[PDB]
Amino acid sequence: GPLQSVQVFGRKKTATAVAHCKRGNGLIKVNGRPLEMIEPRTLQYKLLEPVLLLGKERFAGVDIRVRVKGGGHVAQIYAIRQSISKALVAYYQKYVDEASKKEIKDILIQYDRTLLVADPRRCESKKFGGPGARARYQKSYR
Amino acid sequence: EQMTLRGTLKGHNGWVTQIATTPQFPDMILSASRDKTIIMWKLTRDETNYGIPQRALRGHSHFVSDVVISSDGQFALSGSWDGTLRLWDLTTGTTTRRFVGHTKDVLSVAFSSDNRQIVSGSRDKTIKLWNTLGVCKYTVQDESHSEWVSCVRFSPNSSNPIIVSCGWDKLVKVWNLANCKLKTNHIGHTGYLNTVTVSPDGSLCASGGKDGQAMLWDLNEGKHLYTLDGGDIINALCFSPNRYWLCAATGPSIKIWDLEGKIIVDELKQEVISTSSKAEPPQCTSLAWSADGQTLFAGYTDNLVRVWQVTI
Amino acid sequence: MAVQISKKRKFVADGIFKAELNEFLTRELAEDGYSGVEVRVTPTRTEIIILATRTQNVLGEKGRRIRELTAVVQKRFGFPEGSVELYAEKVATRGLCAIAQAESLRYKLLGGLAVRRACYGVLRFIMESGAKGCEVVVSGKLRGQRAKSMKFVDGLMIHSGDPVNYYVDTAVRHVLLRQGVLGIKVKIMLPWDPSGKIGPKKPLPDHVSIVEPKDEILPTTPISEQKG
Amino acid sequence: HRIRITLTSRNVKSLEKVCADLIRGAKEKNLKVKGPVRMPTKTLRITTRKTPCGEGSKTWDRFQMRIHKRLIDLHSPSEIVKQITSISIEPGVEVEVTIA
Amino acid sequence: GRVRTKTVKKAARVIIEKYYTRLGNDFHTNKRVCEEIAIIPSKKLRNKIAGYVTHLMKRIQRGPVRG
RNA sequence: UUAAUUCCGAUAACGAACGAGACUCUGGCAUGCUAACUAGUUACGCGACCCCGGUCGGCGUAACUUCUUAGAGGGACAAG
RNA sequence: UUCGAUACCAAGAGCUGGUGUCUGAGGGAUUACGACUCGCGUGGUCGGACAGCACAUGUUAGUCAUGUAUUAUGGUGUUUCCCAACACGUAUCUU
């Protein structure tokens, strides 16, 4: 069979995650490990939320690798949950009926917009006369 | 007799600027909108929706202004405000060739009868000839329009290799394509022109602007045939493919005329009034008949394509 | 070069090189209307250009001071012989060069011309040379022991924003008098020339212009001037 | 033949015109060009106090100095590219032609 | 806190005063005609002027706009 | 009314200049563009291990620029 | 149920697009030449048009300029490098 691959990325902060969608059976893996062995375990459902919204039937035809770098733990989990969701939508826009892509996009964007659109917030730079961005040092009189 | 709506084509974010039909397929129309996507539809004419969008053709940076389908029925050519063209195979909707050369927005683009000559009129004061193998063939810069080149059009009559180009400088220029040299200037229009077309005969040409005066033009002699009173701004102009009709988008309505005896065949204006509470009605910016001339497809500026079928 | 230092240290090395060169040449060519320096290190040439107003005084009698200055350049900074070549040239429309005008005022005060007459003489020459707006402020003790600040200003002068970095030319100098020191600040706003010779080629960011609509006349009846 | 022309400059549009000029010269002399690879810009940053004394509010000056690095690799005998790179020099950029 | 300054309003009023023939109700059409007719050195100020032109001319159509 | 002597209104004032703004750097966007052995990726051939696949920052060379890099334009305007 | 349009193929064409000969109409650089400066070497500034040319040398016009080899204030041939037909020229070869 020919190529049916789309490399699609998800950023929430410094962190970035490039999901490599491809034709095949249903497997999802992050840096070799599967989804249900990516700690912290507290945010287990954050990785599963695209699966439990769309079912495992939509991921029957696609085997999505994810490579991740940068940021911290919670940013990386929000990067990858976004990446695989965009990666499937980009697959269904290229190789499948756009009616299917439209249905999936409407299902996700109604549950949570953060799945397809990146969070544009970045850690603000520090200014002098203060220990942080806006905080200032304690002023003394007398 | 009269035309009437069956339904609407709802599958755009930015509003539709151009519609393109091919003679090969009846169940395949191509709509270019003021997002960066060309929507290739599948017409079913079912009770639910007249057509569902089966392909969206991505690759453009800025608004896709123009789109036109080739003779074969495989290739489409689109022109955008980014100042480049795109050549799409309708099969997978991946771009084959991109044409680069212009500086400002490319406002329209047209094929030959052969699909071996492409022409682009732009916001930068030029027309340019294009091969189908990504080559800057010929510029025309000095003897051109003194304002933007609003539109350019090729003719079905293949015996006279001519092109008609309507500009913003209150002209219609006509160039001998093999020479690419001026044949006839056409002064007469008061103000800028939106649209120019060539009647399927290859006989008489139309011209529409803000003035609301649809002036006919001759391709045989350099003579003004006659004029119609549009009333409102004409944004779109095209003839019926089988019948001897001319259809114009007079802003928020369609006015279709019989050409021998100048009287209104009918006027088509949305009767489901949504903009009834201090809102200006959204206005039709492109229209084109089917290959048969049974159905007129008209694209609006509220992200909608409407269908107009002959009740007689 | 086997010493092979970082591009970071290389550029701060070149930075201090020009900085001292300029200091030395401003100290030397002070009285003889000195405008500034420039370096063009070509393949195995250090073409070291000087800009002045009175270039005949600085290049001297049959090139005495030029070879003297080329000698101390090669001797101090540690250069190869043949490679280092000094070139003194005259700066165009000196009226606009804040360095030249500030040092001109300084040496009229060193001669002993009246202070309002010195400042208005300078400020008048700056404006007739074609400065869009001028500013001359000399501070320090006049007529007594309490320190005064005389300000002489005319035309349009901008203070804030980015355009200051390529429209306003500023220079500050010290003048030695018998009772104490006086400070000279010359501040010149250049005019707009599209050539970029006399001033800059960017128009002012807020300044917006409209080309006048060409007086046409609408046609009434349709025409054609057909040809072949 | 595999020769490495790198251009290190503090000003950007100067460096860009030199990068353009060497591509122009290369494509005219009919030799294979590797396009202008843009190494990351180094921002030399020094932040001092403003006041010479210490009898004010604590305000600091943030001095920056960007330094940009491009390189084009060519497949050409030394001579023709040496004579291409001996013309059209400005004071901003600095040249290095590396053979091996 | 979106109050346009004298430079926006004056230059927009002068462009409406002269070139009423080409300007319209669409933002991006008159942005391009404004860029063509007027030499505005920055792009932000171009968008600000074009934005005001297609607000005044959306009210000229209504009634007796003063300035 | 606005962050603002910021504006539109009334108005013997009209037209302007400095400061505010505009400006420069910066942050977020481009599956569009120019490029990459001092950046990668995808496919591949090989090699190692588990029971055809799976893992590899184990080894190596034809495509391409999604991720990294830094240039040119675009984009946002209280515009609907 | 007659008459002229419409899918088809062929009989060569013409068209059109691709390939590419040749010339420079042109377009560049500095190295001709000029100018402006001098430390007398250059350094800037024109950058091919703005220098020169020898009665050499193409075309000839006011027949009158002239005091009839003459020179008009012919005003364009000669030629030192480079890229070049979007100058859509067109050789060949295709479509």
Resolution in A: 3.4
Report the CATH number of the A1-142 domain.
3.30.230.10
Angle at B55 between CA B53 and CA B56, to 5 degrees: 100
Q: Is residue E66 part of a domain?
A: no
Please tell me the distance from the alpha carbon of residue B299 to that of residue B33, in angstroms, as a whole number.
9
Residue C138 φ then ψ, to 5°:
-105, 125
Residue in B104, B192, B280 closest to E22 by CB: B192
Rounded to whole angstroms, the distance from the CA of residue E14 to the C1' of nucleotide F18 is: 24
d(CA B289, CA B19): 10
Give the chain E residue whose CA is nearest to the CA of C201. Answer: E41
* Breaks in chain A after (C-N > 2.5 angstroms): none
In angstroms, the first-to-last Cα distance of chain C is 71
- CA dist B194 and B206 (Å) reads 11
- Strand extents, DSSP E, C7-102: 34-42, 45-52, 84-90
Give the nucleotide at minimum CA-to-C1' distance from C88: G43
Residue entry with tokens 């209504």: E62
At a CB cut-off of 8 Å and minimum separation 6, what does B140 contact? B126, B127, B128, B175, B180
Distance between CA atoms of residues C101 and C34, nearest Å = 10
Instruction: List Cα–Cα distances, C186 to A47, B7, C52, E17, in angstroms.
Output: 66, 76, 17, 43
Query: Which bases of chain G come closer than 7 Å to a protein CB?
Result: 15-18, 29-30, 38-40, 43, 83, 86, 88
- CATH number for the domain harbouring residue E21: 1.10.60.20
Are the C-beta atoms of residues B151 and B165 closer than 8 Å to each other? yes
Look at residue C4 and give its three-state secondary structure: coil
Two tokens, residue C166:
């390529």
Residue C144 CB contacts under 8 Å (≥ 6 apart), including other chains: none
**Inter-chain contact B53–A93, Cβ cutoff 8 Å?**
no
Buried b / exposed e over A15-45, threshold 16 CB at 10 Å, is: bbbbbbbbeeeeebebeeeebeebeeeebee
CATH number, domain of B186, equals: 2.130.10.10
For residue E10, tell me if it sits in a domain. Answer: yes
Instruction: Name residue A126's amino acid.
Output: K
Query: B143: alpha, beta or left, given left = phi > 0 and alpha = psi -120 to 50?
Result: alpha
d(CA A55, CA B174): 60
- In terms of Cβ atoms closer than 10 Å to its own Cβ (0-12, 13-18, 19+), residue C142 is middle
The helix/strand/coil state of C191 is: coil
Pick from B17, B61, B123, B300 the residue to mutate for testing the E interface (most E CBs within 10 Å).
B123
Is B140 within the bounds of a domain?
Answer: yes
Domain that holds residue C56: 7-94
Which experimental method was this entry solved with? cryo-EM
Q: Which residue has the tokens 């040379």?
A: C129
Number of compact structural domains in chain B: 1
Which residue range is the domain that position D24 belongs to? 1-100
The answer to whether B204 and B225 have CB atoms below 8 angstroms apart is yes
Which helix (H) or strand (E) element contains residue C22? Answer: helix C7-28
Q: Is D97 left (phi over 0), alpha (psi -120 to 50) or beta?
A: beta
Contacts for B148 with CB less than 8 Å, ≥ 6 apart: B107, B122, B123, B125, B167, B168, E36
Q: Calculate how close chain C gets to D85, using CA atoms only, in Å.
A: 10
Q: How many CB atoms lie within 10 A of CB B149?
A: 26
Distance from CA of C226 to the nearest CA of E (A): 28
Q: Nearest CA to C159 among C185, C197, C129?
A: C185
Domain membership of residue E39 as a residue range: 6-61
Strand F nucleotides below 7 A of a protein CB?
1-4, 6-10, 16-38, 41-43, 54-57, 66-80
Per-residue CA distances from A26 to A101, A102, B216, C12, C170 (Å): 18, 21, 63, 58, 71
Q: Are B176 and B165 in contact (CB under 8 A)?
A: no
C-alpha distances (whole Å) from B91 to each of B41, B70, B109 are 13, 13, 22
CA–C1' gap, B143 and G72, in angstroms: 39
Count other Cβ atoms within 10 Å, centred on residue A46.
16
What gap in Å lies between CA B271 and CA B70, rounded to an integer?
Answer: 35
Q: Does residue A109 sit in helix, strand or coil?
A: helix
Domain count, chain D: 1
Question: What 8-state DSSP symbol labels residue E57?
Answer: T
**For residue C226, what are the contacts with CB-CB under 8 A and spacing of at least 6?**
B183, B184, B185, B221, B222
Cβ atoms of C187 and C135 within 8 Å: the answer is yes
φ, ψ for residue E18, nearest 5 deg: -85, -65
Look at residue B113 and tell me if it is in a domain: yes
Is residue E1 one of the residues assigned to a domain? no
CATH number at residue D43: 3.30.70.600
Closest Cβ opposite residue C43 in set D44, D67, D86: D86
Three-point CA angle B86, B89, B93, nearest 5°: 85
CB pair distance less than 8 Å for B123 and E32: yes
Tracing tokens 């980015």 back to the chain, one arrives at C162
Number of structural domains in chain E: 1
